[PDB]
């Protein structure tokens, strides 16, 4: 009756950052020692919570958010950060209690000639609220002229393809990111360590 952390970290395919997946974890026990002891993670940043002391705690809900971004954009997956990814794709609250775990996935997600399957939101009129997901493909109206769903002048597609060719630099290579959101309130428990 263990929590399905392997279904998230070792999933064959990750979602695009603009359509980041979230898995609800409840009514299970988990072993966090499989994390923070592995050497695969390039960045393992925790805010508010202690990953080392995670094995003897309990929580109500633990959300596992998954997506793929560039290495340059990994810094933006953090509370109080700004940028195209943080404002328009994935935003964390200023009181975020959890961990952001990232690693290099050049061997997995980077195809020869361009993956073209990972997209990010390029144009948006306002920034995202915390934990908001905008999966709209409506043509972005950059002027006063209506777009009528056809791209053109002042009318751009809101999403952009990452590319992800294996020969690019480390910054341009895809990075898989898993965001763990921890929450304790009332007393339902259902998410504890050993």
């Amino acid at each position, epitope marked *: 009756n263990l929590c399905p952390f392997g279904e998230v970290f070792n999933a064959t395919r990750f979602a695009s950052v603009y359509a980041w997946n979230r898995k609800r974890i409840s009514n299970c026990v988990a072993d966090y020692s499989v994390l923070y002891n592995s050497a695969s993670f390039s960045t393992f940043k925790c805010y508010g919570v202690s990953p080392t002391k995670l094995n003897d705690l309990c929580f109500t809900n633990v959300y596992a958010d998954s997506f793929v971004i560039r290495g340059d954009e990994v810094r933006q997956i953090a509370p109080g950060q700004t940028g195209k990814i943080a404002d328009y794709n994935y935003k964390l609250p200023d009181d975020f209690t959890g961990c952001v775990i990232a690693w290099n996935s050049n061997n997995l997600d980077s195809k020869v000639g361009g993956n073209y399957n990972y997209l990010y939101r390029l144009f948006r009129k306002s*920034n995202l609220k915390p934990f908001e997901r905008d999966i709209s493909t409506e043509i972005y109206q950059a002027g006063s002229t209506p777009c009528n769903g056809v791209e053109g002048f002042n009318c751009y597609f809101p999403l952009q393809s990452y590319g992800f060719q294996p020969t690019n630099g480390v910054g*341009y290579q895809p990075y898989r990111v898993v965001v763990l959101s921890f929450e304790l309130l009332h007393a339902p428990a259902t998410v504890c360590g050993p």
Partner: antibody, heavy 117, light 108 residues
Framework: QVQLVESGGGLIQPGGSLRLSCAASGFTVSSNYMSWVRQAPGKGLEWVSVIYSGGSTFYADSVKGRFTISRDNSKSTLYLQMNSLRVEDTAVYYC???????????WGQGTLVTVSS | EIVLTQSPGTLSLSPGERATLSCRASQSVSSYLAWYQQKPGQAPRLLIYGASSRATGIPDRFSGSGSGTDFTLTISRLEPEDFAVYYCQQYGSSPRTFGQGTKLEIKR
């Protein structure tokens, strides 16, 4: 049609402040990335600052903490408040519409900012 | 800070010939390069974006080529109004940087 007309350039002593205006036409300034690009006399181009369509602000290191880019949707104008100006800042400042923080597709006529004592 | 280097410093060709320009990058930028034309006393004008895509209103005689660290802008059948200073700009990594430009003058 897209028009970018700039104002505010002139002569200012070192440490003095100076504000640049950029009246825009042909698009909504609140929905587009906009950037300032300066060019020192006889030198190459240098990016200065950009404002995202969502209001996010980013500046080059050489001007960070001194310049402050801003927009006014009501008047359709892009501003660049240049404070604590230095002799090195002497350049022609261009106002350019930015396509997703990648490239500048439309440019203004350019205004000359001269910083000297 | 990633530096763009343009060659030649100045190019001299007669009208009707083919002009080839170079832009070499400090690091690979992966087709995140643009080309700008600037006539004396005017603002830069966008020519190529994406290192190969042609901007709206740009004649077919301008073509962008290259990837990674090496890029090339070619102008065929030079017209007298095609002679100016041409800049390359990368947008692979912040901050975005330009080049020193390449002066293109008519030979007589």
């Amino acid at each position: 049609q897209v028009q970018l007309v700039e104002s505010g350039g002139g002569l200012i002593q070192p440490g003095g402040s100076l504000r640049l205006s950029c009246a825009a036409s042909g698009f909504t300034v609140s929905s587009n990335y906009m950037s300032w690009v300066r060019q020192a006399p006889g030198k190459g181009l240098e990016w200065v600052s950009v404002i995202y369509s969502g209001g996010s602000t980013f500046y080059a290191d050489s001007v960070k903490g001194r310049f402050t880019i801003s927009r006014d949707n009501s008047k359709s104008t892009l501003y660049l408040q240049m404070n604590s100006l230095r002799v090195e800042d002497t350049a022609v400042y261009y106002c350019a519409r930015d396509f997703g923080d990648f490239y500048f597709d439309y440019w203004g006529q350019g205004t000359l900012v001269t910083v000297s004592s | 800070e990633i530096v763009l280097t343009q060659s030649p410093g100045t190019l001299s060709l007669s009208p009707g010939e083919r002009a080839t320009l170079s832009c070499r990058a400090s690091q690979s930028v992966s087709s995140y390069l643009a080309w700008y034309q600037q006539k004396p006393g005017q603002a830069p004008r966008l020519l190529i974006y994406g290192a190969s895509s042609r901007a709206t209103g740009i004649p077919d005689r301008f073509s962008g080529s290259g990837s990674g660290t090496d890029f090339t802008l070619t102008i065929s059948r030079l017209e007298p109004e095609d002679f100016a200073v041409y800049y390359c700009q990368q947008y692979g990594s912040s901050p975005r940087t330009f080049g020193q430009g390449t002066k293109l003058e008519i030979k007589r």
